[PDB]
Amino acid sequence: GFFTVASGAHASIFVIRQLPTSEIRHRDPIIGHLIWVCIALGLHSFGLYCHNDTLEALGRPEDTFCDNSIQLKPIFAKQFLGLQPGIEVLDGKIVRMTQELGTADFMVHHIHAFTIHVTLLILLKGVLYARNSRLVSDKLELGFAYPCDGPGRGGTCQISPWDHLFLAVFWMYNCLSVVIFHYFWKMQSDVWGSYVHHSSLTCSHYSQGDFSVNSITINGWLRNLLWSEASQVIQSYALPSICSYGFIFLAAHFVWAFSLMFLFSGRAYWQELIESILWSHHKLKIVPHIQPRALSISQGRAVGLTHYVLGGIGCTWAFIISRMLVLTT
Amino acid sequence: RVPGGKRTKELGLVVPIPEEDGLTDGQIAALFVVALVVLIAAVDLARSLYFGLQPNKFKTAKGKGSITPFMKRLIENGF
Amino acid sequence: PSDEEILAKGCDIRVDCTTKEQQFAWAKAYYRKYNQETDGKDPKYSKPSTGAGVFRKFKIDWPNPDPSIPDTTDGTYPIRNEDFLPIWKQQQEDLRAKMKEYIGREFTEIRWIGDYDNARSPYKPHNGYY
Amino acid sequence: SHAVKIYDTCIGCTLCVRACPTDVLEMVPATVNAAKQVASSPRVEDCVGCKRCETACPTDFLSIRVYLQENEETQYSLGLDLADWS
Amino acid sequence: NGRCATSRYLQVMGSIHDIESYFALDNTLSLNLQIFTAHWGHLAIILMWISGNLYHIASNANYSLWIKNPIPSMPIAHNIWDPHFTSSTSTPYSHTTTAAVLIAYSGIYNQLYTSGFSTVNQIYKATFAFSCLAVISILLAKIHIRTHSEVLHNSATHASQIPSFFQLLYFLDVGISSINIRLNFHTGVLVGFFSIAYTGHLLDVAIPASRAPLSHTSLSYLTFFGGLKSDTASLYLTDIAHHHLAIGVIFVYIGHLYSSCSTALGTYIRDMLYTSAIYMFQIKSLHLALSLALAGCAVLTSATAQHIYSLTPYFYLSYDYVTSVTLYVHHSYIASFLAIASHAHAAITLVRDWVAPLELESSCTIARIHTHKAAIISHLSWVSLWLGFHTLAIYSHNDTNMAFGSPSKQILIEPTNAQLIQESSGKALYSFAINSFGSFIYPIGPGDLYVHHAIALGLHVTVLILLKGALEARGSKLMPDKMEHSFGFSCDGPGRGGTCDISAWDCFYLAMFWMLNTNAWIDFYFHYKYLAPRQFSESSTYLESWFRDYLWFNSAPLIRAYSALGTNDLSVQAWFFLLTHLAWATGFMFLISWRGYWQELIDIILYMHLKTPILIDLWNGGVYTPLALSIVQARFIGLVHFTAGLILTYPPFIISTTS
Ligand code: CLA
Numbered sequence A: 001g002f003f004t005v006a007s008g009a010h011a012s013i014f015v016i017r018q019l020p021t022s023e024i025r026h027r028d029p030i031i032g033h034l035i036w037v038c039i040a041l042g043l044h045s046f047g048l049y050c051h052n053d054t055l056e057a058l059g060r061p062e063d064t065f066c067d068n069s070i071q072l073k074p075i076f077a078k079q080f081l082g083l084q085p086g087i088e089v090l091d092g093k094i095v096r097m098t099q100e101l102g103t104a105d106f107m108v109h110h111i112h113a114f115t116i117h118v119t120l121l122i123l124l125k126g127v128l129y130a131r132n133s134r135l136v137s138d139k140l141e142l143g144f145a146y147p148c149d150g151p152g153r154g155g156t157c158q159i160s161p162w163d164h165l166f167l168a169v170f171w172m173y174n175c176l177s178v179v180i181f182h183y184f185w186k187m188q189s190d191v192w193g194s195y196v197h198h199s200s201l202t203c204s205h206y207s208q209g210d211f212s213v214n215s216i217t218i219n220g221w222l223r224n225l226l227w228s229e230a231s232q233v234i235q236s237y238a239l240p241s242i243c244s245y246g247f248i249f250l251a252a253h254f255v256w257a258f259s260l261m262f263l264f265s266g267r268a269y270w271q272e273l274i275e276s277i278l279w280s281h282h283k284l285k286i287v288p289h290i291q292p293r294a295l296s297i298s299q300g301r302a303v304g305l306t307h308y309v310l311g312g313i314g315c316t317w318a319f320i321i322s323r324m325l326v327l328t329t
Numbered sequence B: 001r002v003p004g005g006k007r008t009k010e011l012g013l014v015v016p017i018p019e020e021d022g023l024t025d026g027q028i029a030a031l032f033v034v035a036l037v038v039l040i041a042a043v044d045l046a047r048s049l050y051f052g053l054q055p056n057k058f059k060t061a062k063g064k065g066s067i068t069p070f071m072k073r074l075i076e077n078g079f
Numbered sequence C: 001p002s003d004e005e006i007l008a009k010g011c012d013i014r015v016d017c018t019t020k021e022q023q024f025a026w027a028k029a030y031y032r033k034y035n036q037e038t039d040g041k042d043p044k045y046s047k048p049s050t051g052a053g054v055f056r057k058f059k060i061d062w063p064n065p066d067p068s069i070p071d072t073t074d075g076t077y078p079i080r081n082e083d084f085l086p087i088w089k090q091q092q093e094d095l096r097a098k099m100k101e102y103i104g105r106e107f108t109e110i111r112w113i114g115d116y117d118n119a120r121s122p123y124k125p126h127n128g129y130y
Numbered sequence D: 001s002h003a004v005k006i007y008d009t010c011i012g013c014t015l016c017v018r019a020c021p022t023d024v025l026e027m028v029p030a031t032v033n034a035a036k037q038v039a040s041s042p043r044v045e046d047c048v049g050c051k052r053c054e055t056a057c058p059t060d061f062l063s064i065r066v067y068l069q070e071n072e073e074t075q076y077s078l079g080l081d082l083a084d085w086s
Numbered sequence E: 001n002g003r004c005a006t007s008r009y010l011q012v013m014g015s016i017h018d019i020e021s022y023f024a025l026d027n028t029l030s031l032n033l034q035i036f037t038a039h040w041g042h043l044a045i046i047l048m049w050i051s052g053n054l055y056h057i058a059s060n061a062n063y064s065l066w067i068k069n070p071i072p073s074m075p076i077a078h079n080i081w082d083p084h085f086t087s088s089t090s091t092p093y094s095h096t097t098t099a100a101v102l103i104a105y106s107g108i109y110n111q112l113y114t115s116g117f118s119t120v121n122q123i124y125k126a127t128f129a130f131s132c133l134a135v136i137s138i139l140l141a142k143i144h145i146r147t148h149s150e151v152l153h154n155s156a157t158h159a160s161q162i163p164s165f166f167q168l169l170y171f172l173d174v175g176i177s178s179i180n181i182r183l184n185f186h187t188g189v190l191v192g193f194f195s196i197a198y199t200g201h202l203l204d205v206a207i208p209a210s211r212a213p214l215s216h217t218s219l220s221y222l223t224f225f226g227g228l229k230s231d232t233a234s235l236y237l238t239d240i241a242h243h244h245l246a247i248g249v250i251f252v253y254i255g256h257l258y259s260s261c262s263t264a265l266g267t268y269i270r271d272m273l274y275t276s277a278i279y280m281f282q283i284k285s286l287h288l289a290l291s292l293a294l295a296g297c298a299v300l301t302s303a304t305a306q307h308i309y310s311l312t313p314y315f316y317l318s319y320d321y322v323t324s325v326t327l328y329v330h331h332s333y334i335a336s337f338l339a340i341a342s343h344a345h346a347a348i349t350l351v352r353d354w355v356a357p358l359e360l361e362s363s364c365t366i367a368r369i370h371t372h373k374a375a376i377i378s379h380l381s382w383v384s385l386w387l388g389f390h391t392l393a394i395y396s397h398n399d400t401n402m403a404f405g406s407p408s409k410q411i412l413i414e415p416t417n418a419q420l421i422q423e424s425s426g427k428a429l430y431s432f433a434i435n436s437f438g439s440f441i442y443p444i445g446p447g448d449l450y451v452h453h454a455i456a457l458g459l460h461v462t463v464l465i466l467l468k469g470a471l472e473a474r475g476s477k478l479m480p481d482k483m484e485h486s487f488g489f490s491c492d493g494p495g496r497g498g499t500c501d502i503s504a505w506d507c508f509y510l511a512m513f514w515m516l517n518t519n520a521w522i523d524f525y526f527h528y529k530y531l532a533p534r535q536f537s538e539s540s541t542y543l544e545s546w547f548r549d550y551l552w553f554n555s556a557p558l559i560r561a562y563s564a565l566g567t568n569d570l571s572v573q574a575w576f577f578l579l580t581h582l583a584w585a586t587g588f589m590f591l592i593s594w595r596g597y598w599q600e601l602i603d604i605i606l607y608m609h610l611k612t613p614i615l616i617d618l619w620n621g622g623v624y625t626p627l628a629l630s631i632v633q634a635r636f637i638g639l640v641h642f643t644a645g646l647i648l649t650y651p652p653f654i655i656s657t658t659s
């Protein structure tokens, strides 16, 4: 994900510094159709989850999208290995097992496609509209990394390719978090675990195969994956092995929240606060000749993005690693 | 009910339901008549608020305007 | 006494049921009469579909089904390539015997921190080269 | 439309005029300063509100001020391209 | 004006009730009359809300059955008529053959029961009477519009002979803008006499209803016991009546202070303010009056939030586990909103109402404050930094030591000052008893000390942001000429280093996040200490206890409400828990991604629409041409999403945990 957003960034830089290719001359249809496909994908894919949530809450499981109810079979997801029936085991563990795809896999894969397409939309818009646009016609003169062009024309905030990356990084992080959660839950529920005894084995999975039944709802994701599987990391303080992981969980939550400061606030408030503070220093004759300044707009965005991504990644890192370490030992 | 609360299940708290509805159709109809009066008055008030004051009224409206003696006394007293 | 007569008598704090124990006894009777433990949702929605060995029941991938998924719906997974395990054990035992004969002496556990002289070194051994 | 005003602190360096994206400003003769010229804003109807003049103003506080008026937005001040209000 | 964009709706809706900004609202007479009419309509809305609550209690609910066995019974709010619910089988909210019902968490049942309601007929009569009161309010609005119109007509028709007739221009709104008479009558009749009237109501209706044996009303109904009657677990009704009698007498006395109807009696507020420490201010300023009223209302709302929980005034209210928490949280949130409102309207007063003197002149309180606003802000910043540094550092020390498994290594500062104050209060109460008070005194420990310092941090930072906005509203070192610009404007451009969030409205936007945080801290403290007093006392000294024993542990019933196993009566709470999470996350979008990207995206979408074959020939795009939300519009919308999600995701949690 990080290197893909990087490729988008440096594509934008190349467009700014050099002449672009001729596919930029019909950029409006390209980005328009990408916008439409993003909207349609998000609507359908996420609204299936929302429909499942609402109907299940109302008490109508027969109306939801699931294997027992209306089912969205992934017809195109076909085997190619041609493996023999069964699973491969090694000393009380399942080294290899076929992943069986159903409505949950259909829904999660289309969520993946939606998020990938939205990230691609942000990156491609930044690349194609880097030199100029209907809003501002001298974006090339403005450069690559500028905060805006002004409050004019309604407001030209984050029109630069740098800001387009600044948003595409958020979207890449969202996509990768969903991918990580999908992989983690699916592997725990349907692949990993132990077995209990031509011989037939009953496979006891770590998550107990709850992905196919609970993953069909956002509430199921919230309960069976985050809340239920955060027991290890949340209750890791006394345990010698993973107390560090619990503390890092807490600290990553703190850092992620602290990023919202920079992501929501603006330069002028902090500059005025700094001046008011500096009044007292000048009063007491503490005169810093490297005059304090509030972080620039682009720097504030960068700091917020860095802290946001780092905190989220740290929370996920600690959560998954604590769960795995405890379960395997 | 299918209670979902730990305390509800523990203490056996219940939501008793009457055998007969509290109010009858006639009572609901009377309340709706009062509500309709409120609605008509409220629509009139919304129209008045939308149109604000009309200083042109002294040109055509009947009468010569009037200030209550108490209002005159308040004006004389001042603020 | 019993729930029927408890509810027939009813509870009223204002008049007779001035006893919190009686009040909550009536409450428990009403609870048992009018409340249900669960909504009664069909148990099928709780059973797993994928990874439980019962995938074929749902017929999700009927057109050109994946052979690796067991056809049995009992929920048990056979071990893939069972026949090879005895063969693999025989091969590894045969190789062990072959190398044992080739060396001519019992295998000695290697030392993680130990140092061993090369078998072709020209100097007198300090630590056995094996 | 926005309101672009010029104050006598102006020194007539022309940087605002050169930074104007839609040519709202022009230098006019004056005697207030040594440069003998002061920026004017005759075509304020074309002002978009980018405050590039304000960015380029050297004076300690700006001798040119752009007051944004979101209630009186016009197509010229909004830079409308796909839609036409004329 | 035909030439318009889709931003027209948002621009209008952001100032629909900003009457001062209305076009063709020529004068203060129009402003005051419009505000008075709006007030009347607001009173009508309140009365209709009361009537609706009473009607639904009477009709859809079980008040008569509840009052028989209040302790185990649960009040019904209203029925559920929602077609989307399952029809094949009964819902969790029904008795398997009965209309679905919702439990009521507003305490209105206890309110009515201790007020003296015994039958649903009385509730029906009240519903009817409050609807009639709403009619009366609207008709009074109409009456006053007509009376003021008749005075303008008179002034037009009649003129004083001398040229000073224009002086009457100032006195046309005397009835609405007079302060002395309004103060006298409000404090004497609207407060003191209202209290005396409610004492009469208590003595006549509430006391006989509560007391089983009949007894004639007399001074025996006025008592000065204290504490809670054991049977109802609430304050003695006889004491409430004396309370209100005493306050009513005091305020009736105070209501003769100013000269209201004659100049022979009473004193003038201008004269008091002129002769007092505060030199004088624009008492006529409607924004200033609103700010003062909002500050008073905020403090009173906080006081009621604390005292309804501490000293239970309503029958069996304490027994209701959920209603107590809901009431406390509700009124705490209302109080926080009113406080930040007072600050915002003080800022607006400074922006567009205060008449600043010349710079060197320092005669008024506002000018004196503006002289050393820099010192005020620097000291407030110092206090905030100290509180944050040390609270967070002590919490992190405890966190690390607990994670390593050594509670003995935690820093645990005993709350000696609070314990001394509590012991003095307990000594006074014990002396009075020798001559019970539940929840007025609580164990108080180092965890309480840390949480109190955290709440102090929140309050100090919120006040820091609001004071900075107010005192920099007129001017600032970064933007000296901020008086000319409106209260809320987008920015000042990327020049001068960048000027995001430079307006006083932007300071309010920022202080709103803090208010929500400090209120969340307060609510978490109350809820945790309420749910688990012992666990809170022992473990609340490190933040992992808050994150694990409070949130993660108590989140189980809510998330388990509806699942593959089934649903229960908390399924609605679980769906609103997730809906509000989604609303919060949506607010993040408007808060993070700003307008240029979205304007370019809107341009592309508009291009697609104009290139579509059928749609182009019908829709030109000229009228209401779509546009991206302005900078301030998006700031406000993101703030609204954030606030809605944050506020509305809590009640589901508290109901789930306390039910
Ligand atoms: C949960 C939080 C959230 C949500 C809901 C969205 C939603 C969206 N973002 Mg994202 N975004 C977020 C957070 C979120 N964002 C944050 C925090 C940031 C800052 C980094 C961004 C930054 C950002 C950018 C920069 C861009 C997006 C884009 C989009 C859109 C994607 C395409 C689409 O609409 O398909 C899916 C839409 C949804 C899932 C919305 C909910 C639909 C529900 C399920 C159905 C509605 C049912 C019914 C009709 C409701 C009626 C209600 C009424 C009766 C009251 C969509 C509006 C892209 C876009 O606009 O592309 C076209 C885009 O360029 N976002």
Ligand code: CLA
Residues within 6 Å of the ligand: A053, A054, A055, A057, A058, A059, E079, E080, E081, E082, E083, E084, E102, E571, E572, E575
């Ligand atoms: C598809 C999903 C869906 C839909 C469409 C509805 C629809 C409804 N539910 Mg809900 N409900 C749902 C899912 C859904 N539910 C789920 C999953 C659950 C959990 C199992 C519930 C649980 C539930 C309960 C327990 C209850 C309802 C009720 C209702 C009804 C509300 C009527 C009302 O007073 O509206 C009025 C709506 C409002 C006051 C909110 C308006 C908010 C928006 C933002 C507008 C704000 C105003 C603004 C100024 C704009 C005005 C514009 C206008 C003038 C054009 C309505 C039929 C209630 C009912 O039966 O009422 C009779 C009720 O008690 N529902």
Ligand code: CLA
Residues within 6 Å of the ligand: E050, E053, E106, E107, E108, E110, E111, E112, E115, E133, E297, E300, E301, E304, E308, E314, E327, E330, E334
């Ligand atoms: C958004 C605003 C808001 C909301 C929604 C609520 C909601 C609530 N408040 Mg309120 N409250 C608010 C703001 C708000 N409050 C503020 C700002 C304050 C501080 C002043 C208070 C102070 C406060 C107190 C002190 C109490 C509440 C209580 C309540 C509950 C309402 C009970 C009720 O209606 O009984 C139904 C009403 C009646 C049976 C009778 C009402 C009698 C009044 C006087 C009617 C109006 C008189 C009429 C105009 C007179 C006609 C004219 C004639 C005399 C000449 C509920 C939780 C009560 C509570 O917690 O109960 C458990 C409670 O004790 N609130």
Ligand code: CLA
Residues within 6 Å of the ligand: E249, E250, E253, E254, E255, E256, E257, E258, E264, E265, E266, E267, E268
């Ligand atoms: C808060 C303090 C305060 C102060 C500094 C003043 C100062 C003044 N008042 Mg007074 N005034 C006050 C409170 C105060 N007032 C209150 C609370 C009321 C309402 C009752 C009034 C009502 C009032 C009126 C109507 C008038 C004044 C006037 C005056 C002036 C003459 C005072 C005088 O002769 O007193 C000496 C007289 C006395 C000490 C006798 C007072 C006896 C009556 C009954 C009041 C006492 C009430 C008591 C304090 C509360 C009882 C509570 C209950 C539980 C028993 C002076 C500027 C007069 C003036 O010149 O105005 C321009 C005038 O007309 N005042």
Ligand code: CLA
Residues within 6 Å of the ligand: E017, E018, E019, E020, E035, E038, E039, E042, E043, E046, E286, E287, E289, E290, E291, E292, E293, E294, E295, E296, E297, E299, E300
């Ligand atoms: C068109 C829209 C609109 C609407 C719907 C309202 C609605 C309201 N305005 Mg109005 N207002 C408007 C526009 C509007 N306003 C405009 C454009 C202005 C010009 C700035 C004002 C200026 C204004 C002022 C100056 C005031 C109002 C108030 C009110 C209330 C009217 C009466 C009422 O029912 O109070 C119901 C309120 C209660 C039942 C609570 C009563 C308790 C009060 C609020 C607190 C008293 C504290 C006291 C001073 C000190 C206590 C000290 C103690 C702690 C020791 C209501 C909330 C009054 C209000 O209450 O403001 C908060 C008020 O004072 N408005």
Ligand SMILES: CCCCCCCCCCCCCCCCCC(=O)OC[C@H](CO[C@@H]1O[C@H](CO)[C@H](O)[C@H](O)[C@H]1O)OC(=O)CCCCCCCCCCCCCCCCC
Residues within 6 Å of the ligand: D070, E009, E010, E011, E012, E013, E014, E015, E486, E487, E488, E489, E512, E630, E632, E633, E636, E637, E639, E640, E643, E644, E647, E648
């Ligand atoms: C439900 C419980 C939990 C949630 C509680 C509610 C959420 C918290 C409240 C939000 C926090 C801020 C509150 C302050 C409000 C005033 C702010 C303000 O006016 O500035 C908002 C500002 C005002 O607008 C600005 O004004 C400036 C002058 O000061 C300049 O002219 C600027 O150019 C102009 O943009 O910005 C907007 O214009 C915002 C756009 C508003 C769009 C809303 C349209 C859609 C409305 C649908 C909902 C129905 C509304 C009625 C509600 C019914 C309730 C009975």
Ligand SMILES: CC1=C(C#C/C(C)=C/C=C/C(C)=C/C=C/C=C(C)/C=C/C=C(C)/C=C/[C@@]23O[C@]2(C)C[C@@H](O)CC3(C)C)C(C)(C)C[C@H](O)C1
Residues within 6 Å of the ligand: B025, B026, B027, B029, B030, B033
């Ligand atoms: C016109 C005319 C003339 C005439 C005439 C004559 C004789 C006219 C006679 C008219 C006549 C006889 C008109 C009766 C009306 C009865 C009404 C409206 C009753 C409503 C009753 C209502 C709305 C009650 C409603 C409810 O409360 C009820 C009852 C039960 C409650 O649960 C609640 C509800 C709300 C349901 C002159 C004088 C001869 C000459 C002149 O030149 C012209």
Ligand SMILES: CC1=C(/C=C/C(C)=C/C=C/C(C)=C/C=C/C=C(C)/C=C/C=C(C)/C=C/C2=C(C)CCCC2(C)C)C(C)(C)CCC1
Residues within 6 Å of the ligand: B028, B029, B030, B032, B033, B035, B036, B038, B039, B042, B043, B045, B046, B049, E041, E042, E044, E045, E048, E134
């Ligand atoms: C019963 C009956 C009847 C009738 C019926 C009906 C027809 C009803 C209706 C009903 C309805 C249909 C109702 C409704 C209501 C409503 C309401 C009551 C509301 C109100 C409102 C208010 C109060 C407010 C307002 C406002 C607003 C919101 C905004 C601004 C302005 C104002 C302020 C105005 C009859 C006579 C035939 C016969 C007999 C019986």
Ligand SMILES: CC1=C(C/C=C(\C)CCC[C@H](C)CCC[C@H](C)CCCC(C)C)C(=O)c2ccccc2C1=O
Residues within 6 Å of the ligand: A261, A262, A263, A265, A266, A267, A270, A271, A293, A294, A295, A296, A297, A299, A300, A301
């Ligand atoms: C807080 C904030 C500021 C003010 C923040 C500043 C000036 C940063 C302070 C820099 C310090 C001095 C760097 C030194 C590093 C830290 C002090 C290290 C702390 C480490 C702890 C573990 C102790 C902005 O200037 C800003 C600008 C634009 C958008 C958002 C914001 C924004 O959110």
Ligand SMILES: CC1=C(C/C=C(\C)CCC[C@H](C)CCC[C@H](C)CCCC(C)C)C(=O)c2ccccc2C1=O
Residues within 6 Å of the ligand: E009, E589, E590, E591, E593, E594, E595, E596, E598, E599, E602, E627, E628, E629, E630, E631, E634, E635
């Ligand atoms: C999503 C988004 C947009 C785009 C969103 C827009 C233009 C609003 C989207 C429209 C919604 C879906 C409401 C439209 C619903 C109906 C068209 C209502 C019509 C009824 C009228 C009569 C009022 C911005 O313009 C923006 C600007 C600045 C910072 C952040 C953002 C931002 O996050």
Ligand code: SF4
Residues within 6 Å of the ligand: D006, D009, D010, D011, D012, D013, D014, D015, D016, D017, D038, D039, D056, D057, D058, D059, D063, D064
């Ligand atoms: S407005 Fe500024 S840049 Fe332009 S002439 Fe005046 S001082 Fe120079």
Ligand code: SF4
Residues within 6 Å of the ligand: A152, D004, D019, D020, D021, D022, D023, D024, D025, D046, D047, D048, D049, D050, D051, D052, D053, D054, D066
């Ligand atoms: S704001 Fe921009 S367009 Fe308007 S006068 Fe200044 S430089 Fe020219």
Ligand code: SF4
Residues within 6 Å of the ligand: A147, A148, A149, A150, A151, A155, A156, A157, A158, A297, E490, E491, E492, E493, E494, E495, E498, E499, E500, E501, E594, E631
């Ligand atoms: S980034 Fe700052 S300066 Fe640029 S348009 Fe946005 S608010 Fe204005």
